């Protein structure tokens, strides 16, 4: 087995086709299914894996009560083959209430953050063993992508943030080789707040589209030079911004050096990736809540901040159905690097009081050069009957 280099072109995306759906919540009404949140998808060379941060309990379990709390010592990184629901046999790969993982072509890197809020520890587990660890540097919720890292030529890059949730924070880009932190780069550029980065290999570098929880409803971009460890940061130009909350399309504006200061506070983990000067991006259909999910291409959306020309729109989750975190992951095809994305389908508390627990299902779509129709793939759990 050789290290992944992702040294193939991004093949043309006409849109995205359905790939996988775990149906976890629906199954949980009639089976032992983990309570989860912050899911993501990452693939070794042969097959894709679904990850999620368990809450140390199943849904039909007295412990599923009060699972809205996002940091407990019982949260663990769940790992299954994509499409296998988080049943009781699910392997907990590490203790984490924040995590990222990539496969470098040889083994799985898991970056796992747990411990006290202001005193967190990031454990780096590579090929099934703890190789390295770093302590919170800002002592305010050390946290990472909640999506797959990007691992090029055996050098894995993970974006990790520590500091103010909705203010200036200290973001660093760690470079990991076989689980060992060989270099740490501070965030550089114009991105003013970076969380929950959705990163993909863009050979020779890595490109991350992240969450600005402080001042931007436009998403920050972080470009990572894996060779010299240089960092540059910016925002997605697209006038159709991808964060939630955000202003309506008519009144929204973007700036691909600075946050747009439009409903900038708070946000959601999302993703975007460039296609020449265009940008493929997904976002909640609802501008202020995590309801529905759509993807589209913004013509010149990667270079022209005034561009609101949208095309190739696809509804992934209807606007009446709940959405959540979404993130990118990349899959090496025969001759290209395909872009895929998952959507977290959050159900339960606080928004839905019919149940005491907070969990999610996932739906996974993959870029296609072919053709596709329309549909909607929400969670579909009837919480009233649960």
């Amino acid at each position, epitope marked *: 087995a050789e290290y992944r280099n992702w040294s193939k072109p991004q093949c043309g995306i006409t849109g995205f086709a359905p790939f996988s759906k775990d149906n976890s919540i629906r199954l949980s009404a009639g089976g032992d299914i983990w309570v989860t949140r912050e899911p993501y998808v990452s693939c070794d060379p042969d097959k894709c894996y679904q990850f999620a941060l368990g809450q140390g309990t199943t849904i039909n379990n007295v412990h599923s009560n009060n699972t809205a709390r996002d940091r407990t010592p019982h949260r663990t990184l769940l790992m299954n083959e994509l499409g296998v629901p988080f049943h009781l046999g699910t392997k907990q790969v590490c203790i984490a209430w924040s995590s990222s993982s990539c496969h470098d072509g040889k083994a799985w890197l898991h970056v796992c953050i747990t411990g006290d809020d202001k005193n967190a520890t990031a454990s780096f587990i590579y090929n099934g063993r703890l190789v390295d660890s770093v302590v919170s540097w800002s002592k305010d919720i050390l946290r990472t992508q909640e999506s797959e890292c990007v691992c090029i030529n055996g050098t894995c890059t993970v974006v990790m943030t520590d500091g103010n949730a909705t203010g200036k924070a200290d973001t660093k880009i760690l470079f990991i080789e076989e689980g060992k932190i060989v270099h740490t780069s501070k965030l550089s550029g114009s991105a003013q707040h970076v969380e929950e980065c959705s990163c993909y290999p863009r050979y020779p570098g890595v490109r991350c589209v992240c969450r600005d929880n402080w001042k931007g409803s436009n998403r920050p971009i972080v470009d990572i030079n894996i060779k010299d460890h240089s960092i540059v940061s910016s925002y997605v130009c697209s006038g159709l911004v991808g964060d939630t909350p955000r202003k309506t399309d008519s009144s929204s504006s973007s700036h691909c050096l600075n946050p747009n200061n439009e409903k900038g506070g708070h946000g959601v983990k999302g993703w975007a990736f460039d296609d020449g000067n265009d940008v493929w991006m997904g976002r909640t259909i609802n501008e202020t809540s995590r309801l529905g999910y759509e993807t589209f291409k913004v013509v010149e959306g990667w270079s022209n901040p005034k561009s609101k020309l949208q095309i190739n729109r696809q509804v992934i989750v209807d606007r009446g159905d709940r959405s959540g975190y979404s993130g990118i992951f990349s899959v090496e095809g025969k001759s290209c690097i395909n872009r895929c994305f998952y959507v977290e389908l959050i159900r339960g508390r*606080k928004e839905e009081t019919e149940v005491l627990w907070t969990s999610n299902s996932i739906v996974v779509f993959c870029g296609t050069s072919g053709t596709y129709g329309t549909g909607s793939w929400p969670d579909g759990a009837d919480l009233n009957l649960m």
Partner: antibody
Amino acid sequence: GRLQESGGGVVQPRSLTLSCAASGFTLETYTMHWVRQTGLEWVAVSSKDGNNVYYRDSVKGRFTVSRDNSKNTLFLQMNHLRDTALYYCARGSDPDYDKGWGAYRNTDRPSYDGLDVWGQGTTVTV
Amino acid sequence: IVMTQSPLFLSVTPGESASISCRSSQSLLHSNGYNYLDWYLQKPGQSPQLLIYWGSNRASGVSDRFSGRGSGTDFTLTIYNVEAEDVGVYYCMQALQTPPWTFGQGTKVDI
């Protein structure tokens, strides 16, 4: 981080200005509270930017809390003093942003810091 | 929110445990799953120091002898292996519904 209150003293049943100087950290970084001890009784709070305040009901209209982040100084302008207590200046414990300003408690990664730094307190006797 | 502490006075033999209860008139559990309840210790002649925040999170440098527990309206501060340095007044403070920030009456701990 260290806080040092000042301006306390004997005042006649008149006005008095309490000042709280921050050293080792920037006042702009923290919500600032005034807490008085006659047990502990929260008096007033000043937002990080110095543009928002909350007051204890019994001091509303009498006490004015302000700050100068450039000077790293928190102020409590006390008027119509009736209020005898040891007045502490403490940082942290942001209110809920959903009520106008403070921390975003509904974000995915909510954070909270208590009153982790207090001054020694300045005595005010009226 | 009214913050009721009990007992108001506690006598602790050195090396044994001490528990202080604190009840709020309303639940301090936020929808984000965290109980906005702090514990503060005012040692004799000193300013208050944060012991616990969010119900069970020890502050920086606080001995793990101090343990905050509970949720909703009922919270307990347990001082394990009490020592003479632990004497003073322990105040619980709710930070859920503010303003005002409201403290408990304070439990006085002595040897």
